[PDB]
Amino acid sequence: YFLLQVSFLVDEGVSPVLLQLLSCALCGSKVLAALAGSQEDQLCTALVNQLNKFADKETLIQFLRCFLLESNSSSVRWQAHCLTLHIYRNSSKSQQELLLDLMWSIWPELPAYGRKAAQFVDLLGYFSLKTPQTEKKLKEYSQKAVEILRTQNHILTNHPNSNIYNTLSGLVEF
Amino acid sequence: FVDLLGYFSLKTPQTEKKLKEYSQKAVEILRTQNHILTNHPNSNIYNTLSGLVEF
Amino acid sequence: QNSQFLLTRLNDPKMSETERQSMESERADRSLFVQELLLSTLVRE
Amino acid sequence: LTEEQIAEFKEAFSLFDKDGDGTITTKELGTVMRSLGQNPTEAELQDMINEVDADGNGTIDFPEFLTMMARKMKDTDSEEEIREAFRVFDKDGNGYISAAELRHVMTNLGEKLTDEEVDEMIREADIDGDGQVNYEEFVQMMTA
Amino acid sequence: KADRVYHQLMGHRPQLENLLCKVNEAAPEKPQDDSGTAGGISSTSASVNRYILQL
Amino acid sequence: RALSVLGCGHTSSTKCYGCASAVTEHCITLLRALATNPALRHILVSQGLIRELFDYNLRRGAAAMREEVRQLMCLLTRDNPEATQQMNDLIIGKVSTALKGHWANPDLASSLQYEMLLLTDSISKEDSCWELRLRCALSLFLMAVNIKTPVVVENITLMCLRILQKLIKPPAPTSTVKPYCNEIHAQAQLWLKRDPKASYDAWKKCLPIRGIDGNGKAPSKSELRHLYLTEKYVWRWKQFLSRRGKRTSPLDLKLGHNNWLRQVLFTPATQAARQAACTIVEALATIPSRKQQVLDLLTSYLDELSIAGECAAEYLALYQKLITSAHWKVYLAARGVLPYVGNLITKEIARLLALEEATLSTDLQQGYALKSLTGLLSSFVEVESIKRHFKSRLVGTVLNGYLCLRKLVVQRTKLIDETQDMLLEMLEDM
Amino acid sequence: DYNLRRGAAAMREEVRQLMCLLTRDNPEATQQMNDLIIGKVSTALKGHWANPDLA
Ligand SMILES: [Ca+2]
Ligand SMILES: [Ca+2]
C-alpha cells in the first residue's frame, strides 16, 4: 500500500518503476510495465485482497485519476490500465462494484482530460459490461454516458469557430 | 447576335401580342437549357469540380 | 498490436453448422421475397 | 378451333422442333405451349410430357400436339376432370370430400395449412352446411 | 485513334466520380508523411486534401 | 495525495474544440461498448441516443469516428423493432426532404451521403427487423428512380440498388418456398403501407414448402396426373375464394414494359446503377416463367438500346447472357423478336443515311446500337431452326440494310464497317 | 431554382440583378422572391445542426 501512496509524491519518471513493482505484485504485465503455478495466482489474489483491505476509496480514486487520466505518458497509462484491470479481475464482487462505481464517478470529469482518457474509457466500458449489475445503476451509467455525449455535442455545435473547423476538415487536410 | 436581339426588342415600339411572344420564346429557351443542364449525365461532376478545382 | 484495447477485442465471431444451414435458408428465402417484391413492383397497374 | 390458331400452333411447333437425348421434344413442346400464349403450371407440363410417350425422345407430331392441346385447350373448365378431381380430392372412394383428405391433398401438393384454414376452406365449399361437400358443391365452387 | 482516346477520357470518368464521392465525405484525413518524397509536394499542396489533389 | 491535489499531470483548456472532439470520440467508444449488452442497448435507445447520433455525430469527426457512429446506431437498432423503425423513419425523412428541390439544393451529394450509408450498413446487419429496413430501402429507391437527376440517381438510387442487389443475390452460402409459376404472391403497394396482410411471414406462409419431390426410381405416372388435378383445382379453389373476396388476391405475372426497370437499365449518370440493375434482373431470372417475363421486358426495352447508344452495354450483356441458350432464342423468335430487330436495324440505318446527307457530325460510338442489333440478329440466326423459318422474311431486310450501308462514305465508322460485314455474312448464309 | 447557384460568379450576380429587376415596383413579384428566400432559410434552419450544408 505504501508503494502506491509513495507513487503519489514521485515524478512521472519514478511513477513507471513503482507501477511495475505493483504489477509484479498483482501478477500484471510485468514485462509490459518494464517495456513501458496455482499458488502464484493465489498469492496474486491474496495481494489484491490485501490492497483492497488497505486502499480506501479516496486513494483508489486518486491514483486511478493520477495514472490512468493525468499520466501524460501513454506508457504509464497502459501500465495503470493493466494494473487496474487485474485489480478488478482478481477482486471479488463487492470490490468490483465499488471500483466500477468509482470510475463512473470520475466519468463526468472526463472532458478535462481529452485524449489522455482513452485507456480509462476502455476499462470503464469493459467493466460496465463485465460486472453483473442492477438495472438502476445500469440506467444511471447509461444516463451519465449519454449526458456527457449531449454536453460535448452541444459544445461542438455552438463552438465559436465550429463552422471554420468543419469547413477546413472538409477541404484542406489539417 | 443576342446583343442586337435584346437591344432591338427594347428599341422598337412593338405590340403586346408580339412582346408576349418574344418573352415566351426567351423563357422557353431558358427552361429548355435549365432542364438540359439539370438532367445532364455528368452535371453532378461538373458542378462539384466547379466547386472545388479551377478549370 | 491492437490487442491492448479490450473494447476493440470484444467482437467475437461464432456461428454454428446447423445454424449455418438455417441462416443460409433464411438468406435464400429473404432473397426470394425481395425478388417477388420487385416483380410485384414492376407489375403493370 | 379457327385455322388462325392451328397455324400459330404449327408455327411455334416447327420453330421449337428439335431432337436429341432424353425427351427434348417434350421440353421443346412445353416451351411451344408457353410461347403460344398459354403458360401451364410445372405440374401441368410434367403431366402432359408423361401423357405423351409414343416414341424415343417423346416423339410428338403436329396432329399429336393438336390432340394434346384439344384435351384442355385454355384449361377454362373440365367437368369431366372436375368429377375426376372430386374422385381424387375424396381420398376414400367418392361421395363427400372431407377436411381430412382435403389437407392430405394439400400436403401431397406440399402446402401446409393450419386446421383453422382447412375449416375456412370446407365452410366455403359446403352450401347446405351438412359438414359434407358433394359434386353439387365441389362443381359449384369450381364454377363459382 | 479517336475511339481509343475516347476510352481513355471516359475511363477517367469513374475514377473522377470516386474522387468526387471521397471529397464529398469531407473526412479530416491529416496529411500523411509518405516515405517517397520524390514528387515535388509543397507544404501548402500537402495541406490541400489528397482527394482534392487526386481529383 | 496532498501533492497530487496541489498539482498532478496536465489538464485541457476551456472551449477546447479539439479535446471536446476527443471526449466525443471517447463517448462513442464507450457507447459502442455498452450497446453490446441488450438491456443497456434498450436503455440507451430509450434515452434518445439514436436521434442524438443521427443529428450530431453522423457527420462530424474523423471518417473512422463516423463509421464507428454508424456501427453504434446499427447496434442500437439490431434486433430492436422500436429502434429500427425509428432509425428507418429518420432516414426516410432526411432523404425524402432532400429529394424535394434537389435541383434547387444540390448539396444532396453530401447531405444524404451519410444517411444512405447508414441504411446500407444497417441492411448489412442481419436481424428479424430486416423487414422495416428493406421497406425503407425500396421506398427510397422508387422515389429516387422517379427522378432522372444524376445527383439523385448516383446517390439514392445507386445505394438502394446496391442494397437490393446484396439482398437478392446473397453473399454466396458456405454450407424453402418455391413461387407459384403463374402468380406473384407478394405485394409491394400493400407491403410498403405496413399492411399485416402482406409481410415476409404472411408471404412465406402463403407459398408451399419445397419439401422433397422424391420418386427417384418411382415413375408415379398415375400420381403425376393426380397431383396435376389436385394442384389445378386447389388453385381454382383459392382463385374463386378470392374473387368472392374472402381471401387476399394474388398478383398475375404481367409487366407494363415501361417500368423503373428500363429507367435504370439505361442511366447515363453512371454504369454502377446500370450494372446493379443488370445483376438484379439476372437474379430475377431464376425461375423459367420469370425468365420469360423478364425476357419480354428486355426485348421490349430493345428500342431504348438504339436510343441510348453505348450506355446500354450492360443491358446488352445481360440480354445476351439470358438468351445464351437456343431454347430462349427460339422462344423469343416465336414471339416475333426477329422482325422487331430487323425493323430496328432498318430504322437505325435510315437514321444514319438521313445524317449522311445532313451535317458531317463525327461520333465515336456511331453505330454501337446498329452493331449490337446486328449482333443480336446474328446470334438468333446462329440457330438452325430460326434460320430455316425466317430466311425468306429476313433476306429482304438484310439486303436493304446492306445496300443502304454501302451508300455510307463520310459517316462510315469502324463499327459501321463491322455491321456491314456481319450483314454480308448473314446474307451469304441466307 | 436553377440559375441562382450554377454558372460563373459573374453569371450568378447577373441572375441576382435580373431577379431584382423583375421584382422592381412589383408587389406580387417582390413578395414571391421574398417568400422563396423565407422558406429556404426555414428549411435550412429546420436542421442547421443536423445538416451543415446551410451555408
Ligand atoms: Ca368421405
Ligand atoms: Ca352438401
Author numbering:
A (entry chain A): 3302 to 3337, 3385 to 3522
B (entry chain B): 3468 to 3522
C (entry chain E): 287 to 331
D (entry chain C): 5 to 148
E (entry chain B): 3745 to 3799
F (entry chain A): 3857 to 4031, 4044 to 4298
G (entry chain B): 3911 to 3965
Show passages lifted from the paper.
Organisms accordingly deploy silencing factors, such as the E3 ubiquitin ligase silencing factor of the integrated stress response (SIFI), to terminate stress response signalling and ensure cellular homeostasis. After restoration of mitochondrial import, the E3 ligase SIFI marks HRI and its activator DELE1 for proteasomal degradation to terminate eIF2α phosphorylation and restart protein synthesis. SIFI forms an antiparallel dimer of heterotrimers that comprises two copies each of the E3 ligase UBR4, the E3 ligase KCMF1 and calmodulin.
Having ensured that SIFI was active, we used single-particle cryo-EM to resolve a partial C-terminal map of UBR4 and associated proteins to an overall resolution of 3.1 Å. The C-terminal interface is centred on extended interactions between helical repeats from each protomer that are cemented by horizontal coiled-coils at the inner side of the scaffold. Calmodulin docks onto the outer rim of the scaffold, close to a hinge around UBR4 Gly4301 that connects the C-terminal dimer interface to the catalytic module of UBR4. Calmodulin’s N-lobe forms a bundle with two helices of the UBR4 scaffold. The N-lobe is not bound to calcium, and calcium-binding residues are not required for UBR4 recognition. By engaging two distinct regions of UBR4, calmodulin creates an intramolecular bridge that stabilizes the UBR4 lid to anchor KCMF1 to the scaffold. Following an unresolved linker that is predicted to adopt a flexible conformation and of which mutation impacted neither SIFI binding nor substrate degradation, KCMF1 is further anchored above the C-terminal UBR4 dimer interface through a helix that is enclosed by the UBR4 lid. The UBR4 lid engages the KCMF1 helix through extensive van der Waals and polar interactions, including a group of Trp residues that encircle the conserved Phe319 of KCMF1.
